[PDB]
Amino acid sequence: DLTAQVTSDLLHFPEVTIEALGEDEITLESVLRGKFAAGKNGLACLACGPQLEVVNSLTGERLSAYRFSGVNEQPPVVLAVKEFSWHKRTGLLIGLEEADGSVLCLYDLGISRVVKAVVLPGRVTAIEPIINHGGASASTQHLHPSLRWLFGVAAVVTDVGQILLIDLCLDDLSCSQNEVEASDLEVITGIPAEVPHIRERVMREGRHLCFQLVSPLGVAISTLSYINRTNQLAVGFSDGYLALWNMKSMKREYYTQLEGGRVPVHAVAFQEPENDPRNCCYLWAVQSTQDSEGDVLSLHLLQLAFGDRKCLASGQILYEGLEYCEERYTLDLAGTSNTKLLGCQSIERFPLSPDTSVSVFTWQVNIYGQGKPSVYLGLFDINRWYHAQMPDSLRSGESLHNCSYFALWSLDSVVSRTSPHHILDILVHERSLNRPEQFFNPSTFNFDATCLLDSGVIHVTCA
Numbered sequence: 001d002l003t004a005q006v007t008s009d010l011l012h013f014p015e016v017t018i019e020a021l022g023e024d025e026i027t028l029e030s031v032l033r034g035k036f037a038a039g040k041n042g043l044a045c046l047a048c049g050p051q052l053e054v055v056n057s058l059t060g061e062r063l064s065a066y067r068f069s070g071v072n073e074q075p076p077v078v079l080a081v082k083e084f085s086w087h088k089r090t091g092l093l094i095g096l097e098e099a100d101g102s103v104l105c106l107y108d109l110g111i112s113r114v115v116k117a118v119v120l121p122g123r124v125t126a127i128e129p130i131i132n133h134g135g136a137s138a139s140t141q142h143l144h145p146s147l148r149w150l151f152g153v154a155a156v157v158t159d160v161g162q163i164l165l166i167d168l169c170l171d172d173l174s175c176s177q178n179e180v181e182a183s184d185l186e187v188i189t190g191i192p193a194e195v196p197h198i199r200e201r202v203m204r205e206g207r208h209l210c211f212q213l214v215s216p217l218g219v220a221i222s223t224l225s226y227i228n229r230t231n232q233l234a235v236g237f238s239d240g241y242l243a244l245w246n247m248k249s250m251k252r253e254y255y256t257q258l259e260g261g262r263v264p265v266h267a268v269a270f271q272e273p274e275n276d277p278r279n280c281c282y283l284w285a286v287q288s289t290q291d292s293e294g295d296v297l298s299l300h301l302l303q304l305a306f307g308d309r310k311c312l313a314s315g316q317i318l319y320e321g322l323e324y325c326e327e328r329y330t331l332d333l334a335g336t337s338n339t340k341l342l343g344c345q346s347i348e349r350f351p352l353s354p355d356t357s358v359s360v361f362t363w364q365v366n367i368y369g370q371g372k373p374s375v376y377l378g379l380f381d382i383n384r385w386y387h388a389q390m391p392d393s394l395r396s397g398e399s400l401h402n403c404s405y406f407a408l409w410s411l412d413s414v415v416s417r418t419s420p421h422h423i424l425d426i427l428v429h430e431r432s433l434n435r436p437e438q439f440f441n442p443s444t445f446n447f448d449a450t451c452l453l454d455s456g457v458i459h460v461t462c463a
Contacts, residue, residue, distance in 0.1 A: 001401070002409045002443060004377065004460040006417050011060040012456040017046075017053050020065065021454075024048040027075045034424035034452050039083035041090055041109075044425070044452050047078035052094070054109065057427065060456045064112045071119075071180050074099045079124060086132040086152055086170050091115075093154055095124040096179060103182045104156055104166065116175065117182035118166060118208050122158035126224035128233070129154050130247060134171060138313035142231050144250045149195040150209065155233055157221035163213040163235060163245070169203065185210040191250045213245065215252065222264040227283065229272060230304065230319045234283065236265025242285055242302070244325070254325045260287035260298045267344040269359045271382045276353075279306040281319055282382060284359055288341050296335035297363060303328045317352070329385070330393050331400075338366040342375070343426045347433055356433070357382045358442060362411075362426040375411035375423060377449070377462070381442040407442040409462050414451055418458060425452040 024030040027049030034046040044057045054064040080095035094105040102120035134151035152168030187210045223236030235243040244254040266288035289296040307321035342362040348354035366373045384405035400408040432448040446463040
């Protein structure tokens with residue numbers, strides 16, 4: 001019965017941060033959302049209505065704050081936030097939902113200002129940087145020639161299924177615009193040739209070039225992730241389908257409904273095994289109804305088999321030539337109760353392939369007529385799953401509490417300690433992950449983590 005132990009007090013955000021977010025009840029009915037940023041700057045971001053607060057992930061200190069304004073005199077909602085660094089600047093890409101449509105912003109943390117913005121032809125559901133520079137360089141050779149003519153590229157997806165690849169025009173240093181002065185896009189359907197001629201005209205007209213992928217419309221995209229090691233954009237749909245798009249060829253390489261059926265794809269996470277005999281790697285896909293009923297939460301491990309590995313001039317390894325993609329593990333966490341995924345995080349250590357690769361899933365279960373939720377952190381070890389002979393599900397009788405390739409931790413001490421504050425996100429600290437065959441079960445892994453709450457941060461150790 002592995003139980004996390006709390007190692008700090010609750011380190012509160014400053015009052016000014018708490019107060020600013022609590023203006024949630026005017027731009028209401030605004031939900032406070034918060035995530036640790038994926039990059040290497042130790043940031044966590046909280047958003048409520050038009051208000052963004054960037055805080056220090058370990059101390060709770062306020063680092064940056066901004067209240068977005070609406071181009072159409074009505075407050076936008078900060079919907080999506082991603083870390084993004086370019087040149088020698090550190091920033092965030094932000095998707096704003098507006099009454100009309102949407103705006104994609106580039107927010108500079110150095111000066112706490114929006115520096116670029118574009119109007120989106122739809123309602124954004126997710127955003128993802130693809131690359132932070134252009135120019136002819138070994139570092140962009142993995143991308144389709146047409147993207148290489150662009151200068152920074154962000155993917156943006158919408159509630160009707162548009163997939164947009166947008167030029168961030170990071171080569172234009174004369175243009176400093178806020179979210180109110182957002183530029184229009186020039187959207188070309190598919191992927192053209194003669195990009196430079198087009199681009200030059202497009203920018204003389206004060207617009208950003210956008211390639212919209214030829215892809216069916218009508219179903220909302222719910223998840224979006226660029227998988228660096230396979231050069232694939234993963235596009236998860238509200239109907240349970242998952243698309244993989246190769247960003248070299250710009251073609252959809254895979255597209256199938258996950259085994260949970262018509263339930264939205266809520267998150268993905270990539271893993272690479274240490275020793276696999278046919279260039280297989282893995283993509284977890286999480287299906288969840290947490291934004292509606294909250295009755296279904298399931299994990300789906302997709303095995304992606306490729307024909308080759310390629311060392312790029314950059315030094316990076318790339319899986320190339322997708323030969324098959326098939327679901328090889330399924331775990332139902334839910335499906336009265338209410339269950340929601342808090343986080344989904346992959347941690348890999350390299351000594352070629354990582355010698356350690358785990359995915360961490362954190363989820364919360366609320367039973368109706370039960371005040372305090374249970375919170376679980378589960379650690380899946382892909383190599384121990386190999387060692388266990390790749391079972392496709394928990395066996396009869398088998399439990400997460402006693403599984404050779406999965407460790408289950410209770411975060412209930414955190415819940416007791418922090419009530420009634422809500423856990424918004426959980427980050428495991430990669431650098432802390434530390435270790436008779438049973439001994440190499442992941443239950444013996446020690447690690448530290450930080451929970452992001454609505455009012456601060458708090459540190460835990462699992463040992």
